[model samples]
Target: GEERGRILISLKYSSQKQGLLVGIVRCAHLAAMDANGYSDPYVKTYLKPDVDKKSKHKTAVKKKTLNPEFNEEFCYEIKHGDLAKKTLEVTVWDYDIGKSNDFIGGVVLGINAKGERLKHWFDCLKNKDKRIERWHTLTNEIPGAVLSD
Candidate 1:
C-alpha cells in the first residue's frame, strides 16, 4: 500500500531521418503487491497525446517475483519539433492473467513534470544522441500526480 520500488529507464533520439524517439524502460524490483510479498509485474510506456491502445507498449510479465528485470525498448516516430509537447509516462503494474491488472506505481516525464522527472526529461532531450538513464521512485499514485511533482 505504501511506496514500492523503482524503475530505471533510458531515453534517446534515434538518428534515422524520420525522427524517432526511443525509450528503454528497465523492469523494476517491486516491494509486494500481495500478502505473499511477490508480484507478477510488467511495464507500460506511453508517449502522451499520441498514446492509445496501439501506443501503449508493455514488457512481458514476470511472474511471482519480488525482483523482475526487463530491458524492454519502445520507439515512436515523431518530429523533433513535437517532442517538447509530449510527455513520457511509464507505469508498473501487477498482472493477473484472468483479471484486470492492478496499478503498482508510475512516473511521468515532460512538460509540467518537476523534481527528478523534470530533470530526467531535460537531460534526455538535451543529449539527443546519448542514452540517458535514471532511476525513478515508483508511486501508487497515477501519472498525473507524479507529473504534478
Candidate 2:
C-alpha cells in the first residue's frame, strides 16, 4: 500500500559474504521505531566479499564518509564475485523519522564460534551466524535517537 504519507527507509549493508557477518543494529532500531508508529523503515539489501587488508581500509573509509564515526570491524567470508567489489544493501520504509534526529547508532561484527578474527570478509560471514564473546561496532553514528516532541 503506497500512500502519499507512507514512508520509506533505505539502508544498505555490504561485506564479503562467505564467512562474514553483517549486523544492522541501526536498521533494527529503525524497524522498532517504525513498528511503534514513530517511524516506518525497512532494509533493501546487505552484501560482502573478500578483500585485502589495504583494500578494506579504503572501502571502510569510503563508507565512513556517510557516518564518519561508524564502527564496522567484523570477520566474514567471500562466497563469490570479485573480492574488490563485494558489498551489502538495505532499504527501509521511512528514513525521514531519523533524517534529522541524530543520535542514531548501531554495530557490525564478524567472528567465529570459537571467537577469533578472520580479518577476511568471507571468513567473517561464514562464522557470523554463530554467537561470540567480543564484537566490534560496524556503525555507531550516535548512542541513541534524539526525537523531538
Candidate 3:
C-alpha cells in the first residue's frame, strides 16, 4: 500500500562500448499527482560514486498518464575494473509544468542497496555484455545502507 509505482530497469555492462548501459524502460501503476487523476512522468539517473553528482541522464516526458514507456538508454563510460565501485541511481518523477516535480519513487541498485536491487546489480557483473532486466517496486524514499534517519 506504501508503494508509489513500479518500474523496469534494464542494465548491461558493455565491453564493445567500454561502458555501462542503463535502460529506463517503463513504469506501471503510478500514483495520480494531479487533481485530474493523472501524472506526466519522466525519469532521471546518475551512476556513482559521483562525488560531485554531475553525471546525469534524463528520460523524455510522457504526458497525462501513469503508465509510460521510455525505452531510453544511458551510457556510463567506465572500465570493468571500476564496475564494483559504482552504483546505479534511478528516480521517477511526475513532471508538473507549472511547478516543481513530484518525487514519485526511486531505487538505487548497488552494493549499498538491499534485497533484489543488490542481486540485479550483481547479475550484470556476473555476465558479460548481456542485459539484465528486472522490475522494482518504487518506494517513498531513495534507499541504501547509508540511508539512515
lDDT of 1: 0.74
For the record, the alpha-carbon RMSD of candidate 1 to the native fold, in angstroms, is 3.4
TM-score of each: 0.84, 0.25, 0.91
Q: Cα lDDT of all candidates, in order?
A: 0.74, 0.30, 0.85
Worst 10 residues of 1 by lDDT: 140-149
lDDT value, residue 110 of candidate 3: 88
Candidate 1 per-residue lDDT, tens place, 1-149, comes to 24677888887776564344545555456766665778888888778887454677888988887678787777877777777888888888888766777677887899578998898888876777777888888777774533322
The C-alpha RMSD of each candidate to the native structure, in angstroms, is: 3.4, 13.3, 3.0
Which candidate gets the maximum lDDT versus the true structure? 3
TM-score of 3: 0.91
Stretches of model 3 off by over 4 angstroms after superposition: 143-149
lDDT of 2 by residue, 10-65 (tens): 22224333443333233222322333344433222333332343313211211112
Estimate candidate 2's alpha-carbon lDDT, on a 0 to 1 scale: 0.30
